[PDB]
Amino acid sequence: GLMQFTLPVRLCKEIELFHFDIGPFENMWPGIFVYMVHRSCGTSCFELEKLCRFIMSVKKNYRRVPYHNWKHAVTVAHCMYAILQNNHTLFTDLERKGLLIACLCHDLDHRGFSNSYLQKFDHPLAALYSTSTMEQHHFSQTVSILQLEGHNIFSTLSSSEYEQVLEIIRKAIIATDLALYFGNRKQLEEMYQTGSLNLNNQSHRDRVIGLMMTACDLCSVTKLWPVTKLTANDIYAEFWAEGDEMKKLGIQPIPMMDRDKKDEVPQGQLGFYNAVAIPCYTTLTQILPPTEPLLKACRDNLSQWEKVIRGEE
Numbered sequence: 001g002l003m004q005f006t007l008p009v010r011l012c013k014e015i016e017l018f019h020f021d022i023g024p025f026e027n028m029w030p031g032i033f034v035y036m037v038h039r040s041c042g043t044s045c046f047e048l049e050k051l052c053r054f055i056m057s058v059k060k061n062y063r064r065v066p067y068h069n070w071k072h073a074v075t076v077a078h079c080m081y082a083i084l085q086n087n088h089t090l091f092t093d094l095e096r097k098g099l100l101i102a103c104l105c106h107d108l109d110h111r112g113f114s115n116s117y118l119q120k121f122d123h124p125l126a127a128l129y130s131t132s133t134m135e136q137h138h139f140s141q142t143v144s145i146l147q148l149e150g151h152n153i154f155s156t157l158s159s160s161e162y163e164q165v166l167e168i169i170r171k172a173i174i175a176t177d178l179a180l181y182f183g184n185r186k187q188l189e190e191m192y193q194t195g196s197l198n199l200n201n202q203s204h205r206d207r208v209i210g211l212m213m214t215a216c217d218l219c220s221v222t223k224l225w226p227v228t229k230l231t232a233n234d235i236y237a238e239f240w241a242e243g244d245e246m247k248k249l250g251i252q253p254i255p256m257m258d259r260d261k262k263d264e265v266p267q268g269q270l271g272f273y274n275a276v277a278i279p280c281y282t283t284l285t286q287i288l289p290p291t292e293p294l295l296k297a298c299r300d301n302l303s304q305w306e307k308v309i310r311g312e313e
């Protein structure tokens with residue numbers, strides 16, 4: 001109870017900022033997450049013994065892949081922490097509980113391959129889950145870990161509160177399927193502009209939480225340039241492995257996954273910022289004004305990719 005987590009001064013200050021990088025010391029990431037739960041949710045939200053056992057089981061079930069790894073899980077949870085802390089009174093007690101856990105669990109047991117590669121491979125998961133294949137798997141893995149003895153961090157919730165929080169986590173994790181993002185943002189855009197957007201309407205909250213999940217998931221594009229640029233290498237390390245595996249199935253991959261087309265990465269990032277990232281943080285900033293620093297950092301990184309193309313870096 002009286003056992004707080006405390007970070008060194010630089011981390012205590014910088015963790016509050018959207019653009020915080022969790023650093024290369026893996027052994028500090030569990031402490032960083034508990035710190036964020038305690039400040040976001042409270043020292044009472046979870047039994048520390050159960051939370052610590054949940055965290056280490058989640059870590060164990062992330063794989064040693066270039067990008068979709070334990071560091072990504074904690075990075076996405078921190079972006080959610082920053083949004084929740086800058087939007088104090090907008091979110092319920094259960095929502096703050098659910099979303100930090102949802103973010104930590106959102107890519108559980110990722111193999112570094114897209115839904116599309118699972119389908120073309122004819123992976124068993126593609127027969128079990130026809131759409132949002134990996135995301136249904138990520139939710140399935142979350143429930144499994146929650147049901148390990150001593151791992152049920154929600155035990156002190158009532159039956160209906162427990163069902164509500166698992167429903168928050170399920171929708172939050174499905175929403176990280178980027179294929180669903182385009183339509184979710186368009187609906188939120190129309191709702192905001194026509195003025196029909198209502199945060200007491202559960203279906204509306206669900207959409208807002210979905211966009212928050214996309215925003216946290218894409219948050220590598222909202223870091224300082226050197227972090228964004230170095231994270232890009234890990235992202236493309238996976239894309240190019242998938243492209244290799246597409247070639248082994250006798251299918252030319254999209255250029256984004258074809259390592260022979262490394263040259264075109266700068267223009268590819270531009271399209272992505274313009275088509276996905278900037279739209280995402282613009283709509284998020286309209287709905288939740290205090291998330292504007294994510295939009296600003298994203299615009300700064302767009303400007304940096306424009307400089308790469310112009311030969312200035």
Ligand SMILES: Cc1oc(-c2ccccc2)nc1CCn1ccn(-c2ccnn2-c2ccccc2)c1=O
Pocket residue numbers: 178217218219220221235255256257261262263264265266267268269271272
């Ligand atoms: C559209 C395009 O075309 C090229 C390209 C490159 C080289 C040659 C020819 C084309 N590159 C891109 C953009 C690449 N791209 C896609 C998602 N992310 C991303 C950013 C943060 N998270 N994620 C993310 C990663 C995995 C899964 C989900 C999300 C990302 O960087």
Ligand SMILES: [Mg+2]
Pocket residue numbers: 106107134176177
């Ligand atoms: Mg994912």
Ligand SMILES: [Zn+2]
Pocket residue numbers: 072076106107176217
């Ligand atoms: Zn992710």
